[PDB]
């Protein structure tokens, strides 16, 4: 289950299909007010790929219902997250995650 | 105060006057390669730098896989045999030897029983000395320490022989001058080990007990093989040795 | 021999004699007072080193070191003192710290002699299973790492977990991170036998980990019209106001942006920037039990308080918002873009004195709409409510209270404002006399 | 300052600002308080809001007891104002499992302990119970409304009337149970944590339960803090809320342009700050503090040293993990700050070097003593002197054409997989980093020229040594190009060396000049190897008018230039 709460009105006329380049701005946000990742400060937009398991599927689940020029809150469960082990050194085991992923351009 | 500071100041002060000394230090270190071999020279240098990141630090468990991969990469290079003076300039035999030093140590423990560097040190560097054959002399310079650390074990066929002895064997394999320069005090250690090997056989295949390998053991023939290489030359025998 | 509790009393213990012996031993083994000159300092170091090598050859076969480990019997705090003698647990700290630290410097010695305790697995495990004084283990670990890093191999995952549990229990010793960093390169000398193993072992998921935050700085605004409507002798109950936003700019530096138009609980909360263990907040609507307004959800100390309204969106540019206030039967709610917001929010901190509050971060221009000379009202107040412009006093022009604070962006002159909570020194809840 | 009084100060920012200074100060020749300093002077003010981070140290005043411990803070007199308490908890709690940090089958509860206050005396029928994280209020008479009765309601618009137990879940603690236990035998507020925090946690003192529900979502569990009246019965001991904390206000506020025409207010200049991030993940109090909290300053400096030691001599993913805790903007802001304590400044500089300037700088320093040069047409286009005017020229400028190791970095991602090849986990914007370093070098030189009483942090060694170390580490990687190196050179040529410097500072430009001499040596060897090709070609050509060979393989380059 994925719960997406929009904070910017997306057009909704276009959807991200399979096999086109896309630029993405996001800021990771662990629960209980913990910040662990961001992109605005790095000033380097995150570019990634839909459909061949090069990235965790929570981003696909969030971006499936989004569109161009849309910003929304992302919530993901531990099973779709890293889960029982997490990333050793940052993420504790059995921890959910919250994102503010935003779509800029689809090409 | 802080004598490190004054050492730095006096080193810097002396460097201005002995710039010619700096030049004569750097001149043996420099090299010159064809402009068509850069794409392999840079890869060899990257692998050698990856290995040389492991000399102030020591050998562990997860690092031996990467270091074996690096040894294979520096083996499988055209430049590795095309420019024989480059490794003598760079000191890779020295670096591999410090790796072996911190692996072996003063005592006999054999925590890492993977002598993948012993092949690189023994076979290849001694073999490609076609022009300016200083590789054999550089390997000659350390066979006293090699004989002292001649630990049991020959893992390339997985016998309990002595694989570091093969380094001295390959160093003294062919050249008349090196075997001639070899002197008496390094000869008696081998026969001391041979005399210590003079014990009866009781168990089925052991060195001391608890048999694990059941193919075939080796008592002392490797020492006699080393002496066989010591007492002969390219086409004639040697008198003094 | 006398420590054992057999052969019932009329047996003695020379506690004073052994205490004097330990004191004289620490005096004998004291460091060479580095303030001295180089020559006699080195002579003292050589003499200490000779005594240390001498005790080395005498000791770690079947003698003084293992003898002190044997003497370490005190598996109690006061029960041994109550049972045998009158005191049996007091000088343990002295003997432990003194002898173990000096015997560790002894194991350092002349860079060659680290015979037993440097690698004694059982005595190491005994040291990590007690966890009282870490000076000795820090000294032996540092000296062994400097000379020949072989003691670091013994320290393993269980020991790391035990020391992390020590850090969790004993609060912020700042001498435990010292030994944890000594379990690493520690200024140059390094051996990968266990170095990177310990480095990767020190950082699993949230056992010894930190963060940090670069939070945007915000401040709140409020007009000089201070309502402060109390109860009892009722005077007015209905007030209304609305605000305009023009040039919203998300992520002026980072994704976090601040824009609050709702009120909060100002009791115990001031325009001061913040302070406290947990996040008290920098603006209004920032407390744990506070609401403010965001247009999406009325957050209460990072707690899910989502509110559903048609065409959910942030307070974007050219957006209208209004609020309604009640005191007898609180009906605090908002109206944005000609539709009432759901989530009927009632029973917050509602007692005493209220006033309009607004807070925001840089990148925002906000227009006020109160009434009268400046209130070009796009919206009208709901039934009962009247727009808040009647509280202005005669011959006193209204202005912005600036959420009264100490200083602003001023270059030349200074301003050391005095301690005064409000317009009254201490009086609150103003009612007419009766 | 008294009530409704206003004061002003002038520490000596400008001489003309001081009003009555020419009469005595100028004639005698005594300088103002802040004439030597070149930075804005900050001040500290007593906090009106009382803080909640105090322990009783020098205030005015088997299983015998389950928890089994004691404290020494018993009240005697001079207090009747219902004080609020806090004591540190380094002790264990019972023996029903451990739950690691301080499914319970075949058990009732865990962590059986109590913050004991003798309740049998009943001085004023004290209220007892837990409180939340914020109880910043010092009103004597309380429990009239429990500060607030916060209860968020949201339905279809009903349902979901979630209630909050505002500033305290503190129970009535009244007569309550009619048992009336003899002496001080009224429970002593024994604590029993329930396995689940979603429903309720039990913390009672009465012999029978009456009502402690206060249904709230999980908020916090922390050091024990409970209320007690003040008389002389010797009630409280482990089985304060003083307001004497000076608070630094700020240095630079957020500018506001509130004006007329609808009371428009606008803001265009942003501002940011960091917060404390002490281990165990519960602290956030300002950043420019800790200049007066020595214990926490030492603890945080040692934590930074631990980070630097762990991420040293190369590490695959520990650097990536630490990049989440310490991001780029925090590091840049800490580098830029002019008010940071010296220990924290040095720690952050060393952490920056150890995570981002470690691997490639170490590799380049290792390869700096090899002098490997390829053979291309561009290598021939170099001379010992750039012009015939016999001008030496700048050392670092000019082409090198040497086989130096390449620079390869990666991206942190933290939502992706299989990234362990690295130089730094992100890539820094090295251009603006270089610009900031150059501007800070110029600022530090200008500040040290006037010889201020107040350096950037701590003293001049803290001001310079991390900065010079960062500059040297950047310089030994070849990031500088021609114009940047030219601009850097005139900071030392006329002067940085001329001014008086301490010994830790003096140790670093020695390494700088050593690198400059190494660059000159590399230029010399490049010129030599460039002339070598021309000389060898000319000698090979001259070997063709006196050639000699009797081998079967004629015209072999052994005749030209080869021994065998």
UniProtKB/Swiss-Prot annotation, chain A:
Inhibited by both FK506 and rapamycin. Signal peptide: none annotated. Detected in heart muscle (at protein level). Isoform 1 and isoform 2 are ubiquitous with highest levels in brain and thymus. Has the potential to contribute to the immunosuppressive and toxic effects of FK506 and rapamycin. PPIases accelerate the folding of proteins. It catalyzes the cis-trans isomerization of proline imidic peptide bonds in oligopeptides. GO terms for molecular function: calcium channel inhibitor activity; calcium channel regulator activity; FK506 binding; peptidyl-prolyl cis-trans isomerase activity; signaling receptor binding; transmembrane transporter binding. Keywords: Cytoplasm, Isomerase, Rotamase, Sarcoplasmic reticulum. Belongs to the FKBP-type PPIase family. FKBP1 subfamily. GO terms for cellular component: calcium channel complex; cytoplasm; membrane; sarcoplasmic reticulum membrane; Z disc. Pfam families: FKBP_C. Its EC number is 5.2.1.8. InterPro entries: FKBP-type_PPIase, PPIase_dom_sf, PPIase_FKBP_dom. It is found in: Cytoplasm; Sarcoplasmic reticulum. It catalyses: [protein]-peptidylproline (omega=180) = [protein]-peptidylproline (omega=0). Its main location: cytoplasm. This is Peptidyl-prolyl cis-trans isomerase FKBP1B. Identified in a complex composed of RYR2, FKBP1B, PKA catalytic subunit, PRKAR2A, AKAP6, and the protein phosphatases PP2A and PP1. Interacts directly with RYR2. It comes from the Eukaryota. Residues 19-107 form the PPIase FKBP-type domain.
From Swiss-Prot, chain D:
Residues 103-239 form the B30.2/SPRY domain. Channel activity is modulated by phosphorylation. Phosphorylation is increased in failing heart, leading to calcium leaks and increased cytoplasmic Ca(2+) levels. Belongs to the ryanodine receptor (TC 1.A.3.1) family. RYR2 subfamily. The calcium release channel activity resides in the C-terminal region while the remaining part of the protein resides in the cytoplasm. Homotetramer. Can also form heterotetramers with RYR1 and RYR3. Interacts with CALM and S100A1; these interactions regulate channel activity. Identified in a complex composed of RYR2, FKBP1B, PKA catalytic subunit, PRKAR2A, AKAP6, and the protein phosphatases PP2A and PP1. Interacts directly with FKBP1B, PKA, PP1 and PP2A. Interacts with FKBP1A and FKBP1B; these interactions may stabilize the channel in its closed state and prevent Ca(2+) leaks. Interacts with SELENON. Identified in a complex, composed of FSD2, CMYA5 and RYR2. Cytosolic calcium-activated calcium channel that mediates the release of Ca(2+) from the sarcoplasmic reticulum into the cytosol and thereby plays a key role in triggering cardiac muscle contraction. Aberrant channel activation can lead to cardiac arrhythmia. In cardiac myocytes, calcium release is triggered by increased Ca(2+) cytosolic levels due to activation of the L-type calcium channel CACNA1C. The calcium channel activity is modulated by formation of heterotetramers with RYR3. Required for cellular calcium ion homeostasis. Required for embryonic heart development. This is Ryanodine receptor 2. The lineage of its organism: Eukaryota, Metazoa, Chordata, Craniata, Vertebrata. The gene is Ryr2.
